[PDB]
């Protein structure tokens, strides 16, 4: 505290604090006849002393401090977000008082003299008070008097006060509680309850205690966001440093506890050096509760009875300190927003310490406390299923915490009601198809957060959702089979689209830091072992593959011999993210587009800045293993040249998102994505359309890009490529990878190239092989550049320069100013000898494939190696073809004529929904030539032809096997 007024223009953001850790500390204070003030060192919040105020009923003391109270506008301009001037303090009652403390503000007040507020005094321990001076009083520039007036209707009493403060605070976070009414309130949890109720029986009580034990087992037997500490020496040393001591007639003294979000009220960056030094003695709650949790785990595992006893005493003393510091029911502490970051491991520690809390008589207080602070999470904790219940962040950061809270409920019947309701809640959350872009699982196996498929968020949700189902398994509280089934689909999907990292196109705002299925491994074991008929051999086989365990290891784990899964093979469509996966031997190809329902990229203030082309009809090839080891290196990466994309090559200043903060650029039509045939073959259809008027986006940049994938190969074709500038700098990238000693060789037309730098130009009938064993045969292009070169780039978070050596090849479309095009073919198992054979087949009247149509309405590719035909109907059309005659909607159709059968698949990758609306099925009429008889697809012979009726729900292909009618 300084001679300056509160909210002084020298530094408006500089808090004034009466902590009394200074020379002459009651200088600014005056008491009437019926009040006495002293410093006590018995307890304190900031510094070693607090103000002891002995009073008779209705007496006052006054703090003489000039306040230049800012407007909310002024406070907000001074900090840079919505703000208000706040008055705050802490007070301690050793005994409850049946009445109100009155705080008045005005000019030259004495005992007997504008605006003010009430604090209810019916409590013990520390409480915080915090009000907006502009919004929460019932303030003229002349205020110099803050009068603290004891209750009238109570004849005498005693209150400790510390850390009287004037500060600028976030205008969201002065919360009402049982002591003070503010303009803001976070209402208490109101638990939902499902009927019929399970009875309290020995069996249902035993099931509840088993679930608690199963949770203990998971936390004492490797968690992200848990700073595990198993060394007891270190735990004792961190605990002793808290300087906690029990006080004679109750409470503790010890270092003040504060959350990471509570510190904002001080404006720590602007504190005077004297206050900063006292503020620096605080303990961050997250660290404290992590310590409580590490002690609780140590205590469960401890075999030495003396140490075990000490570890319990440390946990219970930490608990007593936390409660006396005011972390109790009906105590807002001004705010506790983002509560989970501060308390997640407190919830869990209560499971481990549940008998110790019972015996110590703390269980009711800790339950009441945690329930009150959980009110932030009311939309999930109330357990009424809603469109928002499938929240993937909840599954990661809160679900086990929610269960822990319920299990801490002291009444047996209410506990069983809560966990029965919890089981129904989780079943509905994991079953329902949320509408529009709301978080959660989807029917093609995608899993959404931030309004799209998002592995970076779904992977931790899968881990902890599987674990929850496993914790509840084989009890009256087990998750419904519908939730198990839906989660299995999402987790088998993740196994298919990861190798073991998800490709660059699925990286979200974290390109080159893809999530890995390795982090989700245990979830596969948990889901396998929680099947109705356990173990689920598919999920068990995947757990062994991802965790690198042998068949020999399987019996001990699953209780039967299970062969580790081989890598999935074939083609899988995932229109939830307008992608598909082609798998052959150990390679995965992520084919990815975007549309109205699928954002191209997520770009934040400091993430993915150059991600514009993340979904530009990419086809990233990944062999099983580290993407970085395969040359997907961020340093020097040309962000223009994402593999398979057609792009405008831009300077990074122009490729950077034009929004300073967030851009999730959606596409201009519903249709773009993939389809599948027989689980083996795929097609991508990508209609590249830019916005009419978004800065840095050329409104005339267009392309039609199709890919047909089968067996060891993919056929890429493009047409109708254009830009505002005659295709200047318009390119299609074949590949890009870093050059390293293990990734040092290219082949071009049978010649090994290792020189750096190196450039050359290829055309139709030429071929290359990248260092990853991918062959590229150029089948229609006038100009294909190949480069081995030093590149300069910038990192996707802070735009800081980077550099690296790269091999790349791209098609230069500037040779064709209007309606540029390309064709090329990729061989996944290329060798120089096989590429020689493929080039010869191409020269033999193209024995590889045939493009039957390549225009703005339809692309049709006949694959002569696989005998499969893909039809990308960018527009409904009638066509001339042996099999397909007409399609009445934008669609992807595929055919395979084998022996006595024609197999036809159809879909629209359009999910037929909005950010708000549920997806509804699209009916597609596909007329095929000739008379056929035969799947949910309906058919009807109509003259010489056969009408097939497909139902495309959420971009999920359907297929039918037809045979010819005489
Ligand atoms: C603020 C912003 O850019 N985006 C909001 C999301 O915030 C990010 O994502 C998450 C997250 O857990 O999903 C946490 C961090 O705040 C941000 O990295 C997110 O907001 S929220 O979860 O923080 O409330 C979503 C909520 O659906 O909204 C984005 O706008
Ligand atoms: C999409 C996303 O940001 N997910 C969050 C995680 O972030 C990814 O994983 C990690 C990681 O090692 O945790 C780091 C990178 O930020 C991302 O690759 C992760 O967030 S954070 O704590 O790492 O900032 C988790 C933490 O709860 O939240 C993810 O889901
Ligand atoms: C003006 C407008 O609607 N812009 C849209 C964005 O929303 C704004 O920006 C952000 C931000 O994090 O940058 C948050 C607020 O919602 C708005 O101030 C944003 O839409 S959304 O994702 O927030 O729904 C983007 C997504 O591309 O669309 C903006 O341009
Ligand atoms: Mg003090």
Rounded distance from Cα 393 to ligand 1 centre (Å):
10
Q: Around 542, how many Cα atoms within 13 Å sit in the side-chain half-sphere?
A: 28
- The protein residue whose alpha carbon is closest to atom 17 in ligand 1 is 604
Nearest to 480 by CA among 442, 519, 426: 426
- The protein residue whose alpha carbon is closest to atom 7 in ligand 2 is 456
Q: How far apart are CA 535 and CA 525, in angstroms?
A: 9
Ligand nearest to the CA of 162: 4
Rounded distance from Cα 172 to ligand 1 centre (Å):
17
Tokens coding 100: 């109100």
**3-class DSSP state of 593:** coil
> Tokens 């803050």 map to which residue?
146
Pocket of ligand 2, candidates 223, 456, 606: which has the most ligand atoms within 8 Å of its Cβ, to mutate? 456
Ligand nearest to the CA of 513: 2
Q: What is the Cα Rg of the chain in Å?
A: 34
Kindly give, in sequence order, each residue whose CB lies less than 8 Å from that of residue 273, ignoring residues fewer than 6 positions away: none
CA angle 645, 646, 651 (to 5 degrees): 100
Tokens coding 589: 């190809």
Torsion region of 857: left, alpha or beta (phi above 0 gives left; psi -120 to 50 gives alpha):
alpha
Q: How far apart are CA 194 and CA 103, in angstroms?
A: 46
Enclosing H/E stretch for 372? helix 363-373
Contact 254, 264 (CB under 8 A): no
**Which DSSP string corresponds to 751-783?**
EEE--SSEEEEE-TT-EEE-TTS-EEEEEE-S-
Order of strands across the sheet with 452-453?
A: 440-441, 447-449, 452-453
Closest approach atom of ligand 1 to CA 662? 3
Rounded distance from Cα 576 to ligand 3 centre (Å):
22
User: Which long-range contacts (C-beta less than 8 Å, at least 24 apart) are formed by 686-692?
Assistant: 686/593, 686/616, 686/617, 687/874, 688/616, 688/617, 688/646, 691/665
Q: How far apart are CA 844 and CA 842, in angstroms?
A: 5
Q: Please, which residues bridge with residue 916 across strands?
A: none
Q: Is 49 annotated as a binding residue?
A: yes
Rounded distance from Cα 671 to ligand 1 centre (Å):
28
Closest approach atom of ligand 3 to CA 450? 22
Q: What is the largest CA-CA distance in the chain?
A: 113
- The protein residue whose alpha carbon is closest to atom 21 in ligand 2 is 225
Ligand nearest to the CA of 501: 2
Omega before residue 777 within 30° of 0, cis: no
CA angle 959, 963, 965 (to 5 degrees): 135
**3-class DSSP state of 25:** coil
Burial of 645 (0-12, 13-18, 19+ CB in 10 A): buried
Helix axes 285-301, 305-324, angle to 10 degrees: 150
Rounded distance from Cα 513 to ligand 1 centre (Å):
19
**3-class DSSP state of 804:** strand
Q: How far apart are CA 316 and CA 327, in angstroms?
A: 15
Q: How far apart are CA 851 and CA 854, in angstroms?
A: 7
Q: How far is CA 217 from the centre of its chain?
A: 26
Closest approach atom of ligand 3 to CA 915? 24
Task: Count CB-CB contacts under 10 A for residue 263.
Answer: 13
Domain residue ranges in the chain: 1-185, 186-567, 568-848, 849-966
Tokens coding 20: 């009394």
Q: How far apart are CA 954 and CA 884, in angstroms?
A: 23
Q: Is 46 annotated as a binding residue?
A: yes
- The protein residue whose alpha carbon is closest to atom 10 in ligand 3 is 662
Q: How far is CA 492 from the centre of its chain?
A: 20
Alpha-carbon dihedral of residues 221, 227, 230, 235, nearest 10 degrees? -140
Q: How far apart are CA 826 and CA 772, in angstroms?
A: 12
Q: Please, which residues bridge with residue 175 across strands?
A: 184
Which residue intervals of 382-480 are DSSP H helices?
392-397, 399-407, 412-431, 455-471
Rounded distance from Cα 467 to ligand 4 centre (Å):
46
Rounded distance from Cα 333 to ligand 4 centre (Å):
17
**Which DSSP string corresponds to 834-885?**
HHHHHHHHHHTT-SSEEEEEESSSEEEEEETTTTEEEEEESS-EE---SSEE
Enclosing H/E stretch for 346? helix 339-352
Kindly report the backbone phi and psi dihedral angles of residue 351, in degrees, each rounded to the nearest multiple of 5, phi listed first.
-65, -50
Question: How does DSSP classify residue 480?
Answer: P
- The protein residue whose alpha carbon is closest to atom 13 in ligand 2 is 224
Closest approach atom of ligand 2 to CA 454? 1
Enclosing H/E stretch for 886? strand 884-887
Ligand 2 pocket list (CB less than 6 A)? 224-225, 396-397, 456-457, 460, 508, 510, 513
Contact 839, 777 (CB under 8 A): yes
**Which DSSP string corresponds to 193-218?**
--SSPPP--HHHHHHHHHHHHHHHHH
Q: Please, which residues bridge with residue 759 across strands?
A: 787
Closest approach atom of ligand 2 to CA 449? 1
Nearest to 119 by CA among 56, 182, 53: 182
Rounded distance from Cα 384 to ligand 2 centre (Å):
28
Tell me, using a 6 A CB cutoff, whether residue 604 lines ligand 1.
Answer: yes
Ligand nearest to the CA of 41: 4
Q: How far apart are CA 868 and CA 63, in angstroms?
A: 86
**3-class DSSP state of 79:** helix
Closest approach atom of ligand 2 to CA 450? 1
Q: Is 881 annotated as a binding residue?
A: no
Task: Give the method used.
Answer: X-ray
Nearest to 272 by CA among 165, 424, 413, 139: 165
Task: Give the 3-state secondary structure percentages of the chain, helix then strand then coil, rounded to 5.
Answer: 25, 30, 45
Rounded distance from Cα 190 to ligand 2 centre (Å):
31
Enclosing H/E stretch for 78? helix 72-79
Nearest to 627 by CA among 514, 519, 712: 514
Q: How far apart are CA 32 and CA 147, in angstroms?
A: 11
Q: Catalytic residue numbers?
A: 450, 457
- The protein residue whose alpha carbon is closest to atom 12 in ligand 2 is 224
Question: How does DSSP classify residue 577?
Answer: G
Do strands 891-898 and 702-710 pair parallel, antiparallel, or not at all (unpaired)? unpaired
Q: How far apart are CA 403 and CA 394, in angstroms?
A: 12
Nearest to 410 by CA among 328, 350, 470: 350
Enclosing H/E stretch for 315? helix 305-324
Q: How far apart are CA 918 and CA 810, in angstroms?
A: 40
Strand residue runs (E) in 70-203: 83-93, 100-106, 115-120, 125-132, 145-149, 156-170
Kindly give, in sequence order, each residue whose CB lies less than 8 Å from that of residue 738, ignoring residues fewer than 6 positions away: 631, 632, 633, 635, 636, 804, 805, 806, 807
Structural gaps in the chain: residues followed by a C–N separation over 2.5 Å:
113, 138, 221, 934
Pocket of ligand 3, candidates 604, 605, 658, 662: which has the most ligand atoms within 8 Å of its Cβ, to mutate? 662
- The protein residue whose alpha carbon is closest to atom 20 in ligand 1 is 450
CA angle 160, 161, 166 (to 5 degrees): 175
Enclosing H/E stretch for 539? helix 537-546
Evaluated on CA atoms 925, 927, 931, 936, the torsion sign reads negative
Rounded distance from Cα 175 to ligand 4 centre (Å):
24
Alpha-carbon dihedral of residues 485, 486, 489, 491, nearest 10 degrees? -100
Q: Please, which residues bridge with residue 105 across strands?
A: 115, 146
Tokens coding 752: 């090994």
Q: Please, which residues bridge with residue 145 across strands?
A: 64, 106
Task: Give buried/exposed letters for 598-614 (b at 16+ CB in 10 A, else e).
Answer: bbbbbbbeebbbbbbbb
Q: Please, which residues bridge with residue 448 across strands?
A: 440, 453
Q: Around 380, how many Cα atoms within 13 Å sit in the side-chain half-sphere?
A: 24
Ligand nearest to the CA of 662: 3
Ligand nearest to the CA of 52: 4
Tell me, using a 6 A CB cutoff, whether residue 662 lines ligand 1.
Answer: yes
Enclosing H/E stretch for 527? helix 521-529
- The protein residue whose alpha carbon is closest to atom 22 in ligand 2 is 225
Tell me, using a 6 A CB cutoff, whether residue 379 lines ligand 1.
Answer: no
Closest approach atom of ligand 1 to CA 393? 12
**3-class DSSP state of 401:** helix
Rounded distance from Cα 599 to ligand 3 centre (Å):
13
Nearest to 40 by CA among 100, 3, 87, 91: 91
Omega before residue 51 within 30° of 0, cis: no
CA angle 892, 893, 897 (to 5 degrees): 155
Kindly give, in sequence order, each residue whose CB lies less than 8 Å from that of residue 208, ignoring residues fewer than 6 positions away: 407, 415, 416, 419, 477
Tokens coding 770: 């990248």
Q: How far apart are CA 884 and CA 852, in angstroms?
A: 12
- Which residues lie at CB < 5 A from ion ligand 4? 19-20, 44, 46-47, 49, 162
**3-class DSSP state of 323:** helix
> Tokens 């008779």 map to which residue?
56
CA angle 703, 709, 711 (to 5 degrees): 160
Closest approach atom of ligand 1 to CA 439? 27
Ligand 3 pocket list (CB less than 6 A)? 659, 661-664
- The protein residue whose alpha carbon is closest to atom 26 in ligand 1 is 450
- The protein residue whose alpha carbon is closest to atom 25 in ligand 1 is 450
Pocket of ligand 1, candidates 393, 464, 662: which has the most ligand atoms within 8 Å of its Cβ, to mutate? 393
Q: Is 162 annotated as a binding residue?
A: yes
Q: How many helices (H) and strands (E) does the chain have?
A: 20, 48
Strand residue runs (E) in 635-694: 646-648, 673-677, 681-689
- The protein residue whose alpha carbon is closest to atom 30 in ligand 3 is 663
């Amino acid at each position: 505290a300084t001679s300056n007024p509160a909210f002084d223009p020298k530094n408006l953001m500089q808090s004034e604090i009466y902590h009394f850790a200074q020379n002459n500390p009651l200088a600014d204070f005056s008491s009437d006849k019926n009040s006495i003030l002293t410093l006590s060192d018995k307890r304190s919040i900031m510094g070693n002393q607090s103000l002891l105020w002995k009073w008779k009923g209705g007496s006052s003391f006054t703090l003489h401090k000039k306040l230049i109270v800012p407007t909310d506008k002024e406070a907000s301009k001074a900090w840079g977000r919505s703000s208000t001037p706040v008055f705050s303090f802490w007070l301690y009652n050793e005994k409850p008082i049946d009445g109100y403390l009155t705080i008045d503000f005005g000019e030259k007040l004495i005992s007997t003299s504008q605006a003010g507020f009430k604090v209810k005094l019916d409590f013990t321990g520390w409480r915080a008070v915090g009000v907006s001076l502009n919004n929460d009083l019932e303030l003229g520039a002349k205020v110099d008097s803050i009068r603290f007036k004891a209750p009238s209707n109570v004849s005498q009493g005693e209150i400790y006060i510390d850390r009287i403060m004037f500060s600028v605070d976030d205008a969201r976070y002065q919360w009402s509680d049982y002591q003070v009414k503010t303009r803001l309130s976070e209402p208490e949890i109101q638990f939902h309850n499902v009927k019929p109720q399970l009875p309290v029986t020995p069996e249902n009580l035993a099931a509840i205690d088993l679930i608690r034990q199963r949770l203990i087992n998971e936390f004492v037997g490797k968690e992200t966001n848990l700073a595990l500490e198993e060394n007891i020496s270190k735990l004792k040393s961190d605990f002793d440093a808290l300087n906690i001591h029990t006080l004679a007639n109750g409470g503790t003294q010890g270092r003040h506890l504060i959350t990471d979000k509570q510190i904002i009220i001080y404006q720590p960056e602007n504190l005077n050096s004297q206050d900063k030094q006292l503020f620096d003695n605080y303990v961050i709650l997250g660290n404290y509760t992590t310590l409580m949790f590490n002690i609780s785990r140590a205590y469960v595992l401890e075999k030495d009875p003396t140490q075990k006893a000490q570890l319990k005493q440390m946990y219970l003393l930490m608990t007593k300190h936390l409660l006396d510091q005011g972390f109790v029911k009906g105590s807002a502490l001004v705010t506790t927003h983002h509560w989970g970051y501060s308390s997640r491991w407190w919830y869990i520690s209560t499971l481990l310490m549940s008998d110790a809390l019972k015996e110590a008589n703390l269980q009711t207080q800790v339950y009441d406390s945690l329930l009150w602070y959980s009110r932030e999470f009311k939309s999930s904790f109330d357990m009424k299923v809603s469109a928002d219940s499938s929240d993937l962040d909840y599954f990661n950061t809160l679900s086990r915490q929610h269960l822990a809270l319920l299990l801490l409920e002291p009444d047996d019947q209410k506990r069983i009601n809560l966990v029965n309701t919890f089981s129904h809640y989780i079943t509905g959350a994991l079953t329902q198809v949320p509408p529009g872009g709301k978080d959660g699982l989807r029917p093609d196996g995608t899993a959404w957060r931030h309004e799209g498929n998002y592995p970076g968020y779904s992977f931790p949700a899968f881990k902890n959702a599987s674990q929850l189902i496993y914790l509840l398994r084989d009890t009256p509280f087990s998750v419904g089979e519908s939730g198990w089934n839906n989660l299995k689909k999402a987790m088998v999907s993740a196994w298919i689209y990861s190798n073991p990292e998800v490709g660059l196109p699925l990286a979200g705002r974290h390109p080159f830091n893809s999530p890995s299925l390795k982090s989700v491994a245990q979830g596969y074991y948990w889901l396998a072992m929680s099947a109705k008929s356990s173990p689920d051999k598919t999920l068990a086989s995947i757990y062994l593959a991802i965790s690198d365990k042998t068949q020999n290891e399987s019996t001990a784990i699953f209780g039967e011999t299970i062969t580790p899964a081989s890598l999935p093979q074939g083609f899988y469509a995932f229109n939830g993210g307008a992608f598909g996966i082609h798998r052959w031997q150990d390679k995965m190809v992520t084919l990815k587009a975007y549309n109205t329902n699928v954002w191209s990229s997520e770009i934040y203030n400091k993430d993915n800045r150059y991600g514009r082309y993340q979904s530009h009809g990419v086809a990233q090839i990944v062999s099983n293993g580290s993407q970085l080891s395969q040359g997907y290196q961020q340093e020097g990466w040309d962000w223009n040249r994402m593999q398979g994309a057609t792009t405008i090559h831009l300077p990074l200043k122009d490729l950077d998102s034009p929004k300073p903060h967030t851009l999730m650029q959606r596409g201009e039509r519903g249709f773009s994505g993939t389809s599948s045939l027989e689980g083996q073959y795929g097609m991508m259809a990508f209609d590249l359309i830019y916005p009419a008027n978004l800065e840095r986006f050329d409104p005339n940049f267009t392309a039609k890009k199709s890919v047909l994938a089968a067996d060891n190969h993919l056929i890429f074709i493009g047409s109708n490529i254009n830009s505002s500038d005659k295709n200047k700098n318009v390119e299609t990238t074949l590949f890009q990878h870093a050059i390293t000693p293990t990734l040092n060789t290219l082949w071009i037309n049978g010649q090994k190239i290792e020189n750096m730098p190196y450039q050359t130009t290829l055309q139709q009938g030429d071929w290359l092989i990248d260092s990853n064993g991918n062959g590229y045969l150029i089948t229609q292009a006038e100009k294909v550049n190949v480069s081995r070169q030093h590149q300069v780039s910038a990192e996707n978070k802070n735009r800081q320069p980077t550099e690296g050596n790269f091999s790349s090849a791209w098609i230069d479309h500037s040779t064709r100013p209007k309606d540029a095009s390309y064709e090329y073919m990729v061989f996944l198992d290329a060798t120089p000898e096989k590429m020689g054979e493929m080039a010869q087949k191409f020269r033999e009247n193209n024995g590889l494939y045939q493009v039957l149509r390549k225009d703005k309405d339809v692309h049709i590719i006949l694959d002569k190696l696989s005998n499969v035909t893909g039809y990308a109907f960018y527009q409904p059309a009638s066509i001339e073809d042996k099999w397909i005659k007409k399609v009445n909607k934008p669609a992807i159709v595929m055919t395979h004529r084998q022996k006595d059968t024609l197999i036809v698949s159809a879909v629209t990758p359009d999910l037929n929904m909005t950010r708000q609306k549920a997806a509804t099925p699209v009916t597609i009429n596909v007329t095929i030539n000739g008379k056929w008889q035969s799947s949910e697809v309906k058919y009807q012979v109509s003259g010489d032809n056969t009408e097939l009726t497909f139902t495309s729900y959420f971009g999920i292909p359907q297929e039918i096997k037809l045979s010819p009618l005489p």
